[PDB]
Amino acid sequence: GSLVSKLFEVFVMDISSLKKFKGISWNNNVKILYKQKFFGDIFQTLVSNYKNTVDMTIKCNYLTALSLVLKHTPSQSVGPFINDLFPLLLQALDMPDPEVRVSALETLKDTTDKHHTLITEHVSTIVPLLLSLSLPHKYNSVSVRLIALQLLEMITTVVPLNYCLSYQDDVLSALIPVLSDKKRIIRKQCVDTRQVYYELGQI
Amino acid sequence: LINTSEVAKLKLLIMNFSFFVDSYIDLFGRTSKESLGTPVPNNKMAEYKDEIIMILSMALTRSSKAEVTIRTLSVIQFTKMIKMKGFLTPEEVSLIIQYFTEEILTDNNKNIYYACLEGLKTISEIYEDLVFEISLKKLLDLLPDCFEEKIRVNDEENIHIETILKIILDFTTSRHILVKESITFLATKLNRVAKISKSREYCFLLI
């Protein structure tokens, strides 16, 4: 099941060779609805199984499978599944592949844009996880840290000032290797993140 | 205030207790590092202190691992009850620290995980020696002689070797005794894993 979970991304990917390309019409039996349909067939059972699972292996499998499915399906096109996805969504924020990282960061972006009760009830949990994402690591690429900055900004904008005032100093302190890392868009955006956090806390 | 493990009854009990702790605080005071053991003269909550301690203990621990709101409210009310000036003995806060550490290493649920982190950090800022003795020393003891091992918290649940390092990074950020003894012990383990073991990433993470 672990191998199947890590290989389960294959079901949902682009082809670049078999779609209803302009010109050709005899290309294949193309159906664009495969992505969404597959998500609607996979997600629900996966999440029910994850909430009905105990150990390292099988829960890691469920997280990896649902993440590798959600990574290729557009996050904004899968809305009804977001609510039950929020637990595994928060789960998928710590694992080696930056692909699932960018995917789950995008999905929290869309969720906090749409959902706010989940964000308000789960901010005390999400914030240090985004902090660890923003920390330099063998798994946190410069782009991954940039995306953690973007999610930090988005969740600070969505969450009311009450919780955001309580989570200003940690972001201001645990970002020093991000506004001084190898790339500079990472540095510029970390400077901007620090400044925006400081101005939101001071006001 | 009746013993109950049901999600609804226990949740309403805890959210009720969340207002009685505030009433007690407003009437009497709050903790200071000098008033860590000094109790207020009289009240009716002292007669009910055993009951609230027991209900909180069974609300956080001796409870199912699927409780996110129950255990979050449990650790929150544990911390808030600690926040009273010397109304809970060092034994009570030691038990609370042990509960937080056990439930944070057993469950990955980032709700209970980060709520226990918040509780442990507040205990650290209000109880230096207590947290350093129960939680920090145990966490430093879970890590083994050799790198890349499964940190066996109990018979089944295990955390990563870097989980101890991450927990050390979490608190001790403003606790003088905790941070100094942690630096000393992490240097000791750096030396040990370099001498009796052959590791690079563990030495890098420790330094």
mmCIF file of C-alpha atoms in Angstrom:
data_model
loop_
_atom_site.group_PDB
_atom_site.id
_atom_site.type_symbol
_atom_site.label_atom_id
_atom_site.label_comp_id
_atom_site.label_asym_id
_atom_site.label_seq_id
_atom_site.Cartn_x
_atom_site.Cartn_y
_atom_site.Cartn_z
ATOM 1 C CA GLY A 1 0.000 0.000 0.000
ATOM 2 C CA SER A 2 2.937 2.342 0.569
ATOM 3 C CA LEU A 3 4.294 1.694 -2.923
ATOM 4 C CA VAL A 4 0.791 2.118 -4.348
ATOM 5 C CA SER A 5 0.400 5.410 -2.470
ATOM 6 C CA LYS A 6 3.727 6.770 -3.726
ATOM 7 C CA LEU A 7 2.907 5.614 -7.274
ATOM 8 C CA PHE A 8 -0.724 6.783 -7.084
ATOM 9 C CA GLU A 9 0.145 10.155 -8.654
ATOM 10 C CA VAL A 10 0.229 8.493 -12.083
ATOM 11 C CA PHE A 11 -3.570 8.286 -12.334
ATOM 12 C CA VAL A 12 -3.826 12.092 -12.422
ATOM 13 C CA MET A 13 -1.205 13.870 -14.557
ATOM 14 C CA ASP A 14 -1.004 15.824 -17.784
ATOM 15 C CA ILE A 15 -0.205 13.896 -20.960
ATOM 16 C CA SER A 16 1.179 16.482 -23.469
ATOM 17 C CA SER A 17 0.673 13.785 -26.137
ATOM 18 C CA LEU A 18 -2.932 12.524 -25.756
ATOM 19 C CA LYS A 19 -5.440 15.341 -25.336
ATOM 20 C CA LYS A 20 -7.949 16.955 -27.687
ATOM 21 C CA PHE A 21 -5.211 19.080 -29.224
ATOM 22 C CA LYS A 22 -6.067 21.778 -31.745
ATOM 23 C CA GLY A 23 -6.035 20.294 -35.215
ATOM 24 C CA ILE A 24 -6.128 16.572 -34.473
ATOM 25 C CA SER A 25 -9.517 15.105 -33.570
ATOM 26 C CA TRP A 26 -8.680 11.372 -33.816
ATOM 27 C CA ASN A 27 -6.142 11.680 -30.994
ATOM 28 C CA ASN A 28 -7.819 9.477 -28.369
ATOM 29 C CA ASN A 29 -10.984 8.929 -26.339
ATOM 30 C CA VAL A 30 -10.196 12.178 -24.504
ATOM 31 C CA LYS A 31 -12.166 13.140 -21.390
ATOM 32 C CA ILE A 32 -11.101 16.282 -19.539
ATOM 33 C CA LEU A 33 -13.305 15.420 -16.538
ATOM 34 C CA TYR A 34 -10.971 12.590 -15.527
ATOM 35 C CA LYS A 35 -9.092 14.685 -12.943
ATOM 36 C CA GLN A 36 -12.091 15.940 -10.965
ATOM 37 C CA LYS A 37 -13.906 12.609 -11.257
ATOM 38 C CA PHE A 38 -10.880 10.710 -9.993
ATOM 39 C CA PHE A 39 -10.614 13.099 -7.061
ATOM 40 C CA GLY A 40 -14.281 12.600 -6.223
ATOM 41 C CA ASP A 41 -13.744 8.848 -6.346
ATOM 42 C CA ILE A 42 -10.515 8.847 -4.324
ATOM 43 C CA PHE A 43 -10.561 11.632 -1.721
ATOM 44 C CA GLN A 44 -13.597 10.557 0.287
ATOM 45 C CA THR A 45 -12.534 6.958 0.780
ATOM 46 C CA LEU A 46 -8.952 8.023 1.488
ATOM 47 C CA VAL A 47 -9.972 10.462 4.206
ATOM 48 C CA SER A 48 -12.346 7.970 5.813
ATOM 49 C CA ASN A 49 -9.512 5.461 5.864
ATOM 50 C CA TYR A 50 -7.046 7.966 7.317
ATOM 51 C CA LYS A 51 -9.425 8.798 10.157
ATOM 52 C CA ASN A 52 -9.792 5.009 10.532
ATOM 53 C CA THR A 53 -6.046 4.287 10.766
ATOM 54 C CA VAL A 54 -3.417 4.194 13.515
ATOM 55 C CA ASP A 55 0.160 3.665 12.435
ATOM 56 C CA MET A 56 3.135 5.236 10.675
ATOM 57 C CA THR A 57 2.792 3.309 7.440
ATOM 58 C CA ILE A 58 -0.870 3.232 6.482
ATOM 59 C CA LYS A 59 -1.623 6.816 7.532
ATOM 60 C CA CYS A 60 1.480 8.001 5.678
ATOM 61 C CA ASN A 61 0.178 6.077 2.659
ATOM 62 C CA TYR A 62 -3.223 7.757 2.857
ATOM 63 C CA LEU A 63 -1.653 11.203 3.188
ATOM 64 C CA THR A 64 0.739 10.609 0.283
ATOM 65 C CA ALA A 65 -2.005 9.204 -1.955
ATOM 66 C CA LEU A 66 -4.503 11.996 -1.335
ATOM 67 C CA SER A 67 -1.731 14.580 -1.712
ATOM 68 C CA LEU A 68 -0.436 13.084 -4.971
ATOM 69 C CA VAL A 69 -4.010 13.128 -6.272
ATOM 70 C CA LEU A 70 -4.775 16.695 -5.154
ATOM 71 C CA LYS A 71 -1.453 17.986 -6.508
ATOM 72 C CA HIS A 72 -2.446 17.499 -10.155
ATOM 73 C CA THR A 73 -6.137 18.326 -9.810
ATOM 74 C CA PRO A 74 -6.673 22.096 -9.495
ATOM 75 C CA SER A 75 -7.424 22.961 -5.884
ATOM 76 C CA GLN A 76 -10.091 25.571 -6.694
ATOM 77 C CA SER A 77 -12.004 23.065 -8.865
ATOM 78 C CA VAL A 78 -12.412 20.655 -5.923
ATOM 79 C CA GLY A 79 -14.479 22.573 -3.388
ATOM 80 C CA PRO A 80 -16.865 20.203 -1.585
ATOM 81 C CA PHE A 81 -13.938 17.934 -0.690
ATOM 82 C CA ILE A 82 -11.988 20.746 1.016
ATOM 83 C CA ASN A 83 -13.824 20.465 4.340
ATOM 84 C CA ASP A 84 -12.997 16.794 4.906
ATOM 85 C CA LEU A 85 -9.600 17.448 3.292
ATOM 86 C CA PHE A 86 -8.562 20.016 5.911
ATOM 87 C CA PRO A 87 -7.155 17.398 8.357
ATOM 88 C CA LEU A 88 -5.066 15.656 5.693
ATOM 89 C CA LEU A 89 -4.447 19.108 4.231
ATOM 90 C CA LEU A 90 -2.764 20.136 7.482
ATOM 91 C CA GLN A 91 -1.046 16.735 7.566
ATOM 92 C CA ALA A 92 0.537 17.138 4.111
ATOM 93 C CA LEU A 93 2.634 20.151 5.190
ATOM 94 C CA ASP A 94 5.629 18.059 6.385
ATOM 95 C CA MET A 95 7.069 15.568 3.881
ATOM 96 C CA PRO A 96 10.122 15.523 1.578
ATOM 97 C CA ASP A 97 8.605 16.232 -1.848
ATOM 98 C CA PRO A 98 8.277 19.987 -2.513
ATOM 99 C CA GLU A 99 5.569 19.013 -5.013
ATOM 100 C CA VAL A 100 3.091 18.019 -2.302
ATOM 101 C CA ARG A 101 4.338 21.033 -0.351
ATOM 102 C CA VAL A 102 3.402 23.535 -3.074
ATOM 103 C CA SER A 103 0.139 21.655 -3.652
ATOM 104 C CA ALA A 104 -0.945 21.701 0.000
ATOM 105 C CA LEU A 105 0.166 25.319 0.432
ATOM 106 C CA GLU A 106 -2.008 26.233 -2.571
ATOM 107 C CA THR A 107 -4.875 24.232 -1.083
ATOM 108 C CA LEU A 108 -4.662 26.029 2.272
ATOM 109 C CA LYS A 109 -4.583 29.279 0.293
ATOM 110 C CA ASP A 110 -7.859 28.364 -1.414
ATOM 111 C CA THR A 111 -9.344 27.022 1.833
ATOM 112 C CA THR A 112 -8.560 30.114 3.905
ATOM 113 C CA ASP A 113 -9.878 32.198 1.012
ATOM 114 C CA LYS A 114 -13.139 30.223 1.221
ATOM 115 C CA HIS A 115 -13.252 28.611 4.680
ATOM 116 C CA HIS A 116 -12.714 30.712 7.796
ATOM 117 C CA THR A 117 -14.111 28.624 10.668
ATOM 118 C CA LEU A 118 -11.559 25.893 9.946
ATOM 119 C CA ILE A 119 -8.798 28.503 9.699
ATOM 120 C CA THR A 120 -9.800 30.229 12.939
ATOM 121 C CA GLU A 121 -10.078 26.931 14.824
ATOM 122 C CA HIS A 122 -6.827 25.562 13.358
ATOM 123 C CA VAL A 123 -4.564 28.643 13.277
ATOM 124 C CA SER A 124 -2.893 27.766 16.598
ATOM 125 C CA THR A 125 -1.931 24.481 14.917
ATOM 126 C CA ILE A 126 -1.091 25.681 11.397
ATOM 127 C CA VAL A 127 1.110 28.652 12.333
ATOM 128 C CA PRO A 128 4.137 26.783 13.787
ATOM 129 C CA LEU A 129 3.853 24.249 10.963
ATOM 130 C CA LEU A 130 4.150 27.081 8.436
ATOM 131 C CA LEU A 131 7.035 28.363 10.559
ATOM 132 C CA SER A 132 8.851 25.032 10.203
ATOM 133 C CA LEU A 133 8.077 25.174 6.478
ATOM 134 C CA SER A 134 9.698 28.618 6.332
ATOM 135 C CA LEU A 135 12.769 27.339 8.175
ATOM 136 C CA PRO A 136 15.655 26.201 5.954
ATOM 137 C CA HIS A 137 15.777 22.428 5.735
ATOM 138 C CA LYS A 138 16.904 19.518 3.593
ATOM 139 C CA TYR A 139 13.280 19.437 2.386
ATOM 140 C CA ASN A 140 12.430 23.169 2.408
ATOM 141 C CA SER A 141 13.547 24.563 -0.936
ATOM 142 C CA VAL A 142 13.856 28.319 -1.392
ATOM 143 C CA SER A 143 10.597 28.163 -3.352
ATOM 144 C CA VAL A 144 9.023 26.134 -0.530
ATOM 145 C CA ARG A 145 10.015 28.821 1.973
ATOM 146 C CA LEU A 146 8.660 31.501 -0.374
ATOM 147 C CA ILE A 147 5.333 29.662 -0.518
ATOM 148 C CA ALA A 148 5.320 29.343 3.267
ATOM 149 C CA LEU A 149 5.738 33.126 3.326
ATOM 150 C CA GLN A 150 2.793 33.525 0.948
ATOM 151 C CA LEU A 151 0.572 31.255 3.055
ATOM 152 C CA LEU A 152 1.674 33.067 6.210
ATOM 153 C CA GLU A 153 0.549 36.332 4.613
ATOM 154 C CA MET A 154 -2.738 34.837 3.411
ATOM 155 C CA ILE A 155 -3.629 33.231 6.755
ATOM 156 C CA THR A 156 -2.652 36.416 8.602
ATOM 157 C CA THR A 157 -4.948 38.383 6.295
ATOM 158 C CA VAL A 158 -7.856 35.960 6.723
ATOM 159 C CA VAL A 159 -7.530 35.253 10.454
ATOM 160 C CA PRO A 160 -8.826 38.212 12.515
ATOM 161 C CA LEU A 161 -6.371 40.444 14.335
ATOM 162 C CA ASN A 162 -6.970 38.657 17.651
ATOM 163 C CA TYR A 163 -4.986 35.528 16.766
ATOM 164 C CA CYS A 164 -2.677 37.362 14.354
ATOM 165 C CA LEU A 165 -1.376 39.616 17.132
ATOM 166 C CA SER A 166 -0.415 36.451 19.026
ATOM 167 C CA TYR A 167 1.613 35.150 16.066
ATOM 168 C CA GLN A 168 3.775 38.125 15.056
ATOM 169 C CA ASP A 169 7.070 37.637 16.908
ATOM 170 C CA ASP A 170 7.548 33.993 15.894
ATOM 171 C CA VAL A 171 7.319 34.827 12.183
ATOM 172 C CA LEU A 172 9.555 37.868 12.675
ATOM 173 C CA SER A 173 12.196 35.761 14.426
ATOM 174 C CA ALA A 174 12.192 32.450 12.534
ATOM 175 C CA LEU A 175 12.670 34.028 9.083
ATOM 176 C CA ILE A 176 16.293 35.232 9.237
ATOM 177 C CA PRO A 177 17.639 32.534 6.849
ATOM 178 C CA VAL A 178 14.907 33.421 4.327
ATOM 179 C CA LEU A 179 15.638 37.115 3.776
ATOM 180 C CA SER A 180 19.322 36.093 3.557
ATOM 181 C CA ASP A 181 19.195 32.840 1.565
ATOM 182 C CA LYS A 182 20.813 32.051 -1.783
ATOM 183 C CA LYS A 183 18.023 33.382 -3.992
ATOM 184 C CA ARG A 184 16.839 36.972 -3.589
ATOM 185 C CA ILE A 185 13.190 36.823 -4.621
ATOM 186 C CA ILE A 186 13.071 34.648 -1.526
ATOM 187 C CA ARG A 187 14.985 37.394 0.285
ATOM 188 C CA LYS A 188 12.856 40.249 -1.059
ATOM 189 C CA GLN A 189 9.612 38.435 -0.269
ATOM 190 C CA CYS A 190 10.843 37.494 3.203
ATOM 191 C CA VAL A 191 11.681 41.153 3.812
ATOM 192 C CA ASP A 192 8.160 42.015 2.655
ATOM 193 C CA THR A 193 6.647 39.268 4.833
ATOM 194 C CA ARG A 194 8.569 40.490 7.885
ATOM 195 C CA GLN A 195 7.553 44.098 7.229
ATOM 196 C CA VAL A 196 3.881 43.230 6.705
ATOM 197 C CA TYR A 197 3.815 41.074 9.838
ATOM 198 C CA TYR A 198 5.434 43.895 11.814
ATOM 199 C CA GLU A 199 3.000 46.527 10.530
ATOM 200 C CA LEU A 200 0.011 44.254 11.170
ATOM 201 C CA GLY A 201 1.159 43.525 14.719
ATOM 202 C CA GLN A 202 2.008 47.139 15.532
ATOM 203 C CA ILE A 203 -1.459 48.265 14.397
ATOM 204 C CA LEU B 1 -19.304 19.408 36.982
ATOM 205 C CA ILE B 2 -19.857 15.646 36.819
ATOM 206 C CA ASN B 3 -17.305 13.113 35.594
ATOM 207 C CA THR B 4 -17.967 12.362 31.932
ATOM 208 C CA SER B 5 -16.001 11.213 28.897
ATOM 209 C CA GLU B 6 -18.748 11.937 26.351
ATOM 210 C CA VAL B 7 -17.671 14.545 23.816
ATOM 211 C CA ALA B 8 -20.710 16.777 24.377
ATOM 212 C CA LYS B 9 -20.958 16.567 28.174
ATOM 213 C CA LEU B 10 -17.204 16.841 28.738
ATOM 214 C CA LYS B 11 -16.898 19.654 26.186
ATOM 215 C CA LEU B 12 -19.655 21.693 27.849
ATOM 216 C CA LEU B 13 -18.082 20.969 31.244
ATOM 217 C CA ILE B 14 -14.705 22.221 30.011
ATOM 218 C CA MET B 15 -16.095 25.352 28.364
ATOM 219 C CA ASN B 16 -18.045 26.086 31.555
ATOM 220 C CA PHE B 17 -14.868 25.626 33.614
ATOM 221 C CA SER B 18 -13.242 28.089 31.195
ATOM 222 C CA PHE B 19 -15.435 30.790 32.772
ATOM 223 C CA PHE B 20 -15.040 29.693 36.393
ATOM 224 C CA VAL B 21 -11.257 29.828 36.032
ATOM 225 C CA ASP B 22 -11.700 33.399 34.780
ATOM 226 C CA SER B 23 -13.973 34.291 37.705
ATOM 227 C CA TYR B 24 -11.455 32.791 40.138
ATOM 228 C CA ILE B 25 -8.643 34.720 38.414
ATOM 229 C CA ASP B 26 -10.504 38.032 38.537
ATOM 230 C CA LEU B 27 -11.420 37.513 42.186
ATOM 231 C CA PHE B 28 -7.985 36.418 43.416
ATOM 232 C CA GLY B 29 -5.076 36.972 41.008
ATOM 233 C CA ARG B 30 -2.637 35.031 38.826
ATOM 234 C CA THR B 31 0.772 33.378 38.984
ATOM 235 C CA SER B 32 4.078 35.040 39.636
ATOM 236 C CA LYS B 33 7.385 33.189 39.724
ATOM 237 C CA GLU B 34 7.446 34.049 43.433
ATOM 238 C CA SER B 35 3.778 33.064 43.940
ATOM 239 C CA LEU B 36 4.156 29.633 42.311
ATOM 240 C CA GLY B 37 3.033 27.852 45.494
ATOM 241 C CA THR B 38 1.178 30.513 47.473
ATOM 242 C CA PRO B 39 -2.593 29.862 47.591
ATOM 243 C CA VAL B 40 -5.389 32.361 48.175
ATOM 244 C CA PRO B 41 -7.046 32.257 51.642
ATOM 245 C CA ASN B 42 -10.486 30.777 50.974
ATOM 246 C CA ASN B 43 -12.818 29.816 48.128
ATOM 247 C CA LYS B 44 -15.208 27.071 47.071
ATOM 248 C CA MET B 45 -13.064 26.074 44.076
ATOM 249 C CA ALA B 46 -10.534 24.536 46.474
ATOM 250 C CA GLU B 47 -13.254 22.119 47.574
ATOM 251 C CA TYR B 48 -13.793 21.346 43.874
ATOM 252 C CA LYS B 49 -10.107 21.452 42.883
ATOM 253 C CA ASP B 50 -9.752 17.666 43.022
ATOM 254 C CA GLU B 51 -12.829 17.212 40.821
ATOM 255 C CA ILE B 52 -11.682 19.703 38.175
ATOM 256 C CA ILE B 53 -8.168 18.223 38.208
ATOM 257 C CA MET B 54 -9.594 14.720 37.738
ATOM 258 C CA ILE B 55 -11.998 15.750 34.970
ATOM 259 C CA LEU B 56 -9.234 17.595 33.105
ATOM 260 C CA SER B 57 -6.870 14.645 33.515
ATOM 261 C CA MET B 58 -9.423 12.218 32.101
ATOM 262 C CA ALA B 59 -10.355 14.755 29.410
ATOM 263 C CA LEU B 60 -6.796 14.956 28.083
ATOM 264 C CA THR B 61 -5.493 11.483 28.995
ATOM 265 C CA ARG B 62 -7.263 8.155 29.486
ATOM 266 C CA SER B 63 -9.195 9.334 26.420
ATOM 267 C CA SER B 64 -9.369 8.334 22.765
ATOM 268 C CA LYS B 65 -6.761 9.687 20.340
ATOM 269 C CA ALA B 66 -9.440 11.045 17.973
ATOM 270 C CA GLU B 67 -10.382 13.882 20.376
ATOM 271 C CA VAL B 68 -9.142 17.132 18.872
ATOM 272 C CA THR B 69 -11.468 19.692 20.495
ATOM 273 C CA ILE B 70 -11.683 17.742 23.757
ATOM 274 C CA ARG B 71 -7.912 17.457 24.185
ATOM 275 C CA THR B 72 -7.266 21.005 22.967
ATOM 276 C CA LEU B 73 -9.738 22.372 25.520
ATOM 277 C CA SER B 74 -8.227 19.970 28.063
ATOM 278 C CA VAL B 75 -4.689 21.308 27.677
ATOM 279 C CA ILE B 76 -6.045 24.870 27.506
ATOM 280 C CA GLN B 77 -7.886 24.498 30.814
ATOM 281 C CA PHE B 78 -4.855 22.729 32.287
ATOM 282 C CA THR B 79 -2.721 25.741 31.363
ATOM 283 C CA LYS B 80 -5.339 28.229 32.586
ATOM 284 C CA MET B 81 -5.639 26.403 35.907
ATOM 285 C CA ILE B 82 -1.841 26.461 36.192
ATOM 286 C CA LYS B 83 -2.047 30.215 35.592
ATOM 287 C CA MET B 84 -3.422 30.672 39.098
ATOM 288 C CA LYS B 85 -1.044 31.814 41.823
ATOM 289 C CA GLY B 86 0.119 28.745 43.745
ATOM 290 C CA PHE B 87 -3.244 26.970 43.660
ATOM 291 C CA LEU B 88 -1.813 23.781 42.120
ATOM 292 C CA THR B 89 1.086 21.927 43.721
ATOM 293 C CA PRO B 90 4.295 21.108 41.819
ATOM 294 C CA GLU B 91 2.982 17.531 41.744
ATOM 295 C CA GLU B 92 -0.053 18.689 39.757
ATOM 296 C CA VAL B 93 2.023 20.613 37.226
ATOM 297 C CA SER B 94 4.417 17.653 36.995
ATOM 298 C CA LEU B 95 1.479 15.393 36.140
ATOM 299 C CA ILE B 96 0.266 17.977 33.616
ATOM 300 C CA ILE B 97 3.728 18.151 32.015
ATOM 301 C CA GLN B 98 3.851 14.357 31.783
ATOM 302 C CA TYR B 99 0.378 14.321 30.221
ATOM 303 C CA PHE B 100 1.372 16.959 27.664
ATOM 304 C CA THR B 101 4.600 15.172 26.729
ATOM 305 C CA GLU B 102 3.000 11.734 26.464
ATOM 306 C CA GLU B 103 0.056 12.962 24.395
ATOM 307 C CA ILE B 104 2.338 15.026 22.154
ATOM 308 C CA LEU B 105 4.736 12.158 21.391
ATOM 309 C CA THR B 106 1.952 9.582 20.985
ATOM 310 C CA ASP B 107 -0.373 11.558 18.702
ATOM 311 C CA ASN B 108 0.719 13.388 15.551
ATOM 312 C CA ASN B 109 -2.586 15.271 15.457
ATOM 313 C CA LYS B 110 -1.237 18.777 15.043
ATOM 314 C CA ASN B 111 -4.203 20.082 17.030
ATOM 315 C CA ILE B 112 -3.217 18.162 20.166
ATOM 316 C CA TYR B 113 0.446 18.416 19.140
ATOM 317 C CA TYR B 114 0.576 22.211 19.018
ATOM 318 C CA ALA B 115 -1.846 22.623 21.924
ATOM 319 C CA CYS B 116 0.474 20.495 24.071
ATOM 320 C CA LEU B 117 3.374 22.578 22.756
ATOM 321 C CA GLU B 118 1.572 25.731 23.912
ATOM 322 C CA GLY B 119 0.858 24.210 27.319
ATOM 323 C CA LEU B 120 4.447 23.037 27.763
ATOM 324 C CA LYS B 121 5.793 26.440 26.701
ATOM 325 C CA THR B 122 3.536 28.238 29.179
ATOM 326 C CA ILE B 123 4.661 25.846 31.911
ATOM 327 C CA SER B 124 8.251 26.574 30.864
ATOM 328 C CA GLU B 125 7.684 30.313 31.215
ATOM 329 C CA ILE B 126 5.945 29.778 34.577
ATOM 330 C CA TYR B 127 7.844 26.692 35.840
ATOM 331 C CA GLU B 128 11.514 26.427 34.870
ATOM 332 C CA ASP B 129 12.685 23.433 36.904
ATOM 333 C CA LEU B 130 9.426 21.490 36.574
ATOM 334 C CA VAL B 131 9.324 21.363 32.775
ATOM 335 C CA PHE B 132 13.105 20.961 32.522
ATOM 336 C CA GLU B 133 12.954 17.977 34.884
ATOM 337 C CA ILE B 134 9.941 16.095 33.516
ATOM 338 C CA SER B 135 9.594 16.951 29.819
ATOM 339 C CA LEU B 136 13.017 18.146 28.652
ATOM 340 C CA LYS B 137 15.098 15.451 30.358
ATOM 341 C CA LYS B 138 12.782 12.678 29.162
ATOM 342 C CA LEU B 139 12.838 14.030 25.599
ATOM 343 C CA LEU B 140 16.637 14.171 25.715
ATOM 344 C CA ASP B 141 16.562 10.565 26.947
ATOM 345 C CA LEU B 142 14.354 9.203 24.135
ATOM 346 C CA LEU B 143 17.095 9.766 21.551
ATOM 347 C CA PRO B 144 19.456 6.759 21.281
ATOM 348 C CA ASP B 145 23.198 6.230 20.929
ATOM 349 C CA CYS B 146 23.106 5.835 17.130
ATOM 350 C CA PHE B 147 21.561 8.059 14.477
ATOM 351 C CA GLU B 148 18.659 7.077 12.200
ATOM 352 C CA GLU B 149 16.731 5.048 14.761
ATOM 353 C CA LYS B 150 13.004 4.922 15.511
ATOM 354 C CA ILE B 151 12.392 6.892 18.704
ATOM 355 C CA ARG B 152 10.116 4.359 20.400
ATOM 356 C CA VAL B 153 7.878 6.422 22.666
ATOM 357 C CA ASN B 154 5.940 3.278 23.617
ATOM 358 C CA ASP B 155 5.165 -0.203 22.289
ATOM 359 C CA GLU B 156 3.707 1.089 19.006
ATOM 360 C CA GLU B 157 3.873 4.874 18.521
ATOM 361 C CA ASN B 158 7.309 6.228 17.612
ATOM 362 C CA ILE B 159 8.616 9.655 16.614
ATOM 363 C CA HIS B 160 11.505 10.609 14.365
ATOM 364 C CA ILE B 161 15.060 11.214 15.544
ATOM 365 C CA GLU B 162 14.641 14.851 14.478
ATOM 366 C CA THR B 163 11.399 15.136 16.470
ATOM 367 C CA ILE B 164 13.393 15.581 19.688
ATOM 368 C CA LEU B 165 15.477 18.302 18.022
ATOM 369 C CA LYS B 166 12.341 20.063 16.769
ATOM 370 C CA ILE B 167 10.753 19.922 20.234
ATOM 371 C CA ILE B 168 13.954 21.352 21.730
ATOM 372 C CA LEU B 169 13.751 24.131 19.138
ATOM 373 C CA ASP B 170 10.119 24.776 20.110
ATOM 374 C CA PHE B 171 10.550 25.795 23.759
ATOM 375 C CA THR B 172 13.645 26.729 25.827
ATOM 376 C CA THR B 173 13.674 29.865 23.659
ATOM 377 C CA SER B 174 13.338 32.055 26.771
ATOM 378 C CA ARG B 175 14.009 29.638 29.663
ATOM 379 C CA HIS B 176 17.491 30.213 31.084
ATOM 380 C CA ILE B 177 17.949 26.915 32.937
ATOM 381 C CA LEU B 178 16.208 24.950 30.182
ATOM 382 C CA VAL B 179 18.207 26.545 27.374
ATOM 383 C CA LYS B 180 21.577 26.279 29.134
ATOM 384 C CA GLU B 181 21.143 22.644 30.162
ATOM 385 C CA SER B 182 19.767 21.906 26.690
ATOM 386 C CA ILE B 183 22.828 23.441 25.033
ATOM 387 C CA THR B 184 25.063 21.388 27.330
ATOM 388 C CA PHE B 185 23.208 18.124 26.674
ATOM 389 C CA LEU B 186 23.013 18.710 22.915
ATOM 390 C CA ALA B 187 26.769 19.321 22.888
ATOM 391 C CA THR B 188 27.221 16.108 24.887
ATOM 392 C CA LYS B 189 25.145 14.167 22.360
ATOM 393 C CA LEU B 190 26.979 15.830 19.469
ATOM 394 C CA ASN B 191 30.269 14.597 20.934
ATOM 395 C CA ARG B 192 28.805 11.153 21.636
ATOM 396 C CA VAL B 193 27.229 10.605 18.206
ATOM 397 C CA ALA B 194 30.498 11.717 16.632
ATOM 398 C CA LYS B 195 32.701 9.508 18.817
ATOM 399 C CA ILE B 196 30.813 6.259 19.474
ATOM 400 C CA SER B 197 28.586 6.700 16.395
ATOM 401 C CA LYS B 198 29.269 7.686 12.784
ATOM 402 C CA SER B 199 26.708 10.289 11.721
ATOM 403 C CA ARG B 200 26.743 13.564 9.798
ATOM 404 C CA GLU B 201 23.152 14.815 9.597
ATOM 405 C CA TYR B 202 22.608 14.270 13.322
ATOM 406 C CA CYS B 203 25.748 16.239 14.176
ATOM 407 C CA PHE B 204 24.669 18.963 11.745
ATOM 408 C CA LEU B 205 21.169 19.156 13.227
ATOM 409 C CA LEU B 206 22.522 19.191 16.786
ATOM 410 C CA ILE B 207 25.026 21.969 16.106
#
